[PDB]
Amino acid sequence: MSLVYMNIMMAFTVSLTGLLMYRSHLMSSLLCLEGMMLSLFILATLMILNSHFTLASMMPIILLVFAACEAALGLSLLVMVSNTYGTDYVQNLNLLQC
Amino acid sequence: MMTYIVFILSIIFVMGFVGFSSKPSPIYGGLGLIVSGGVGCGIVLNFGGSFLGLMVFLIYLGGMMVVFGYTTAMATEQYNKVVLGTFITGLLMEFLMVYYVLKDKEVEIVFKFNGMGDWVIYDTGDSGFFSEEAMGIAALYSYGTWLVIVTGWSLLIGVVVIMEITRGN
Amino acid sequence: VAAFLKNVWAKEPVLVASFAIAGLAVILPTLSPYTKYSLMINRATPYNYPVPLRDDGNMPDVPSHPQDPQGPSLEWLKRL
Amino acid sequence: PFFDVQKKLGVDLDHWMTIQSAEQPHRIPARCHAFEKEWIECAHGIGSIRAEKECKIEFEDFRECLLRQKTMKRLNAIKRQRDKLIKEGKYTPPPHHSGQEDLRP
Amino acid sequence: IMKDVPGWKVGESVFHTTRWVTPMMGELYGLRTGEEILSSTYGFIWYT
Amino acid sequence: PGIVELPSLEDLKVQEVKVSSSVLKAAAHHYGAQCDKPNKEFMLCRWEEKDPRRCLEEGKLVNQCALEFFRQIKRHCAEPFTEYWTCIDYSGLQLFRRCRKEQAQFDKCVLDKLGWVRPDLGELSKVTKVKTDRPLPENPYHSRARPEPNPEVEGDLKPARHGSRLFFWTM
Amino acid sequence: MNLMITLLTNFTLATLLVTIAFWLPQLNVYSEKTSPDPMGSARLPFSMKFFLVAITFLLFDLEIALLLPLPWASQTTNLNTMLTMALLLIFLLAVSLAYEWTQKGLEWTE
Amino acid sequence: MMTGRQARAPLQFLPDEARSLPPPKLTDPRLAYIGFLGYCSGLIDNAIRRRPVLSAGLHRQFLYITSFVFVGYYLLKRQDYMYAVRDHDMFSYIKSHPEDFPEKDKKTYREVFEEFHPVR
Amino acid sequence: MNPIILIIILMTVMLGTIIVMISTHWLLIWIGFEMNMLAIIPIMMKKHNPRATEASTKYFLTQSTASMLLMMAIIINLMFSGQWTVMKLFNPMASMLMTMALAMKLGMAPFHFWVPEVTQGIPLSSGLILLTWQKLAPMSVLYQILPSINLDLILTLSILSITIGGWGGLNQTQLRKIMAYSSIAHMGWMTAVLLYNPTMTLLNLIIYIIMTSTMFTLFMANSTTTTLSLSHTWNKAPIMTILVLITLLSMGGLPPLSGFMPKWMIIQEMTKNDSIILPTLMAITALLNLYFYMRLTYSTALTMFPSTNNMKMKWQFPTTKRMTLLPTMTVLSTMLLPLTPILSILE
Amino acid sequence: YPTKETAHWKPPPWNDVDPPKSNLTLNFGPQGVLRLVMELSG
């Protein structure tokens, strides 16, 4: 297929493996998650603008809004984590091993 | 060179994601995702999606990454080998992809991809006195009734959920 | 309904103006006689091409020329 | 569970955005409207198991309209043979493929 | 051009159906110069 | 698959209407009133055949009927027309509303010397009818035969034989 | 193309001015300054209220993103449905604001 | 499996052609078993709240029996309907495809040779 | 929590699952999952302790990752099909990504790694919602995409879920982790019979929801979250020991009980398709689940562990808890096997 | 079945509520004239 789809999919997989291999922070995880959402926005947008399918032009906006609301939820979760340990470190979230 | 410009922007786009997928710090991660959003917006603008690209600016960057940098600046009190190694790893993977698809005009990582510039796939007609993208977004209120109901209900519930889980009571 | 309205207009006039403007915005298109003309102007704006019909032999109300009398007229839009 | 509430109650919640051949605003056709209309009218009612083998021609036409992979492969072959014949000096472009012919209308 | 290549059908449709297909941008402006390419493929988008 | 059949370059040669877009837009309403019939023949042919190669000769008639529109302007009213499309040509959006006295002079001169009446608001967007002699396309999509549907359900509904037949359940 | 040239020109002028501001007074050979705040060295206390006004911004900005196609949506032929859904979106934004009010969300930054 | 059969008329618990079928009697052993489940639900409801198990809430036990018989009657009707639809589709398909269901030559055991295996 | 807000949030959870069930467009499927997660987050953080916030964080990360893989599968479906119908998938890459996304939403192994954590961190009612209601929407999408599900993928996920959910609960003394590993094993049982007969998938889902709702309702009635706290039940409420006895003997698949019904029918639809090794290995692996069910019945019903003195006070207060549908669910989760041919109502 | 790895695990609390494990002090000094020491709670 088209050559720009290669780069947008590979960007999605780069941000996937960033979101699938944490270092320390939960904020860097949410950044990788929203990079995944951004790459989905770009890819759905390039398809819908390519094929001239008119009614799906409202589709990525929806894909923005919900997922941006999703990001808000995650940020609040992070803040509750940072209201317990003082950092947003993912290694402090191990109380449920037992 | 200029006929490949979206491709070139897309390369910067992939580079921008390695700017934060290696996760140097969440503030440098935020900066990398801002530059990535700008170039991906430019990619959206070059297929004719002006309104969608300005949603990437107004809502993704100027709306949401503002809140990411805001929340991050309220943490990570102000003052790597793995970061730079993973960064050059992803960069060399992407430039090997560039070199392969520019020397072969064909590549297959998971799907087959053409090596010519993406100007070839476009349409050769006009849309008259409307942008088809603008009218498909204007269709959200006439044809998109159920979508507006469920989206507005999810945003109202989102406000309620954010107020519940941050109260602590 | 009378003392309460004067009380909320004395304490919180911004909110009273808010709910009054929103209430007029809700109810007044259902009562306006010009709401129909918005519909009739938006459907009379020709974004596309009026793709003509094959004259099979019995279409008495479809014109053969734009300046023919039969067909949709917009004298209401010129006059109002 | 596919509780088909829309067909039961007669409401149209999400069928309009489902296909490209549906009713679009201002009658805008998609770039593969005819191919998708032919694939849908082929594969209608006969089930997916029959439709994967009895509508393969319409679906290959529609997929190759969408992605243009055979078209771009053919353009790759034409352009690469043209570049080889330019490099070997066996071919020259015409004046109308150089920009010196004052285009038609 | 495509005289040397074995087994090539000139003007062969990549589509199975004989219906007219709207020409792609690369089908029309493929063999032309990059100036006409850019003017046809990003002219309106880049215009001011 | 098959070879696509394109017309030769002799089939595409026609006397091109080489006027600018402001000349077209200034002369637009009288072109839509006076060159109605072969234009609508052509556009009916163009939406029914769905193939421009089947619509060439009618298009030539369009390119024949447009030029006779402009020569008949050039024989009688070249000066008010030139003054009108120059003022249309000045504007960036090519507004009609900036150019009403030149339109008035052009419409007065055309209505006197050629008897043409400008279409009223709402007329050129009417859906008209075209009497043609070409046949209706019985397969404009070049569609093949559709697959035959699955057989329906019919007849009366008898009960299940000996119940459910699930291993030992007698009902 | 004109826009990309304009953006590049503005970025180049801004970078030139920033470079002149960060490097022209460096050539002053004034003096080395020995031993170059209300809180001394305490950590930054997290304010829940700043995060609350930021997330309230984000959610109402999403509702704004839904409202942004309205000058194009007034041009439709299905105006009763369009008007109902537009008033319903602005009403749900107002219900979000009223719920943010009455559950003490707009407090000490009211 | 039969999801294309009940897709032309979706979300019908009992369609119209279900009325062509005989309904279960009120003395159905399956319906009596579901009434017994209602009685067991009533006894367990009195046992978990420390009530006299047979004595307390005869109105409540009777509503348990009534509600389970009421739900189970329609469940049994739909059950018999779906097995009748299964058999109807089977028989229509065997009638429409005779080449996939040939009539077998039933041979008597005077021609049928089975290998004998002595147990010793 | 405000009870009005609780009612609106539970209706929004139910609304998101219904929007997944009733929609024909993929964007509305994704919207239903987003609405469902966004509304179930406060149900997990109801008691406001760091275990609930950690559990909600882990749940958010896994379900967000699954939703992103779901939308990527949908976008690749629009690439290779040009349309949005919730039906079969027109690319094996999109089929693989959607099967992965739904496996992450269900907690099927090796994406099971969030289910015993989150169920431990949240209350018993929210864990009941997570293990019963939150299995409905991904199994509905797996019901509707099964002409494109790869066989070896779904069977690998199924046997790996059955084996890992079997060996999980043998080491567990916490009841919510026991129900979580039971969830992983039973979801493997549901997806194993998926491509062969999805009616038996629906039967297994309904019987599992009934039995899990019975066990969580008994856990909420007795206010026990550990095995050793559940062992105090005979001195307080002796009928509840009989109820957890018959329900845990049902959940192990022991005849003549109703929980024997699904797995038997699963075998009944897998030996038709000439798979004999796979339902045999699955049935033998279910003995692990039955072993820790027997461990719980030994601790609760069949022996009498020593209680304490303060239990004598609780003899003087009857249960004021609304044990909703507990006799109905207890009867349905045990005495339903003579009504086995009722499964044709799910066809 | 406690192994060597799962030996440092204690059982969770009975109500499943964990223990949670300072207000800002500002010096608005001389930089008429006045020094202020602020104890602020936000």
Ligand SMILES: CCCCCCCCCCCCCCCCCC(=O)OC[C@H](COP(=O)([O-])OC[C@H](O)COP(=O)([O-])OC[C@H](COC(=O)CCCCCCCCCCCCCCCCC)OC(=O)CCCCCCCCCCCCCCCCC)OC(=O)CCCCCCCCCCCCCCCCC
């Ligand atoms: C004039 C207008 C009015 C006309 C009125 C006409 C009727 C007059 C009499 C009124 C009463 C009628 C009663 C129903 C008809 C007869 C049903 C019958 O006996 O079926 C024989 C049935 C098959 O025998 P058959 O020789 O082939 O058929 C004779 C008839 O043609 C059977 O007829 P069928 O071929 O139509 O039967 C259909 C089918 C025939 O059956 C089959 O196709 C075979 C499969 C049956 C299910 C097997 C499941 C195995 C795994 C689970 C084991 C469950 C636990 C076992 C028991 C634990 C302790 C309760 O039945 C089913 O599928 C229903 C499921 C089984 C329930 C049977 C009815 C129970 C009613 C009373 C409920 C009280 C509790 C009973 C015990 C609960 C457990 C069953 O026998 C069994 O399956 C053995 C199990 C026990 C049967 C229940 C006996 C009913 C009377 C019980 C009185 C004592 C209660 C003591 C207190 C409570 C328990 C502690």
Ligand SMILES: CCCCCCCCCCCCCCCCCC(=O)OC[C@H](COP(=O)(O)OCCN)OC(=O)CCCCCCCCCCCCCCCCC
């Ligand atoms: C139906 C029309 C559409 C309605 C929805 C659209 C609304 C558009 C405007 C958006 C409003 C968003 C915010 C609403 C918040 C309402 C709650 C509120 O503010 O209550 C508190 C307030 C008293 O203020 P207090 O809490 O004391 O503030 C501290 C500072 N002193 O309490 C008050 O001041 C009392 C407020 C309630 C009574 C207002 C009555 C106004 C009547 C105007 C005339 C009739 C208009 C028709 C509609 C009537 C609807 C009720």
Ligand SMILES: CCCCCCCCCCCCCCCCCC(=O)OC[C@H](COP(=O)(O)OCCN)OC(=O)CCCCCCCCCCCCCCCCC
């Ligand atoms: C093809 C299939 C299609 C779909 C079929 C239908 C699927 C049904 C799925 C059922 C899912 C049930 C989820 C849980 C119930 C929802 C409401 C809820 O949250 O109830 C719990 C509630 C919370 O009360 P709270 O104050 O939090 O208590 C804490 C202790 N102080 O209250 C309590 O804690 C009270 C204690 C008792 C609660 C018992 C609730 C039982 C609910 C399940 C009934 C069985 C399912 C329906 C029948 C079978 C259908 C398959």
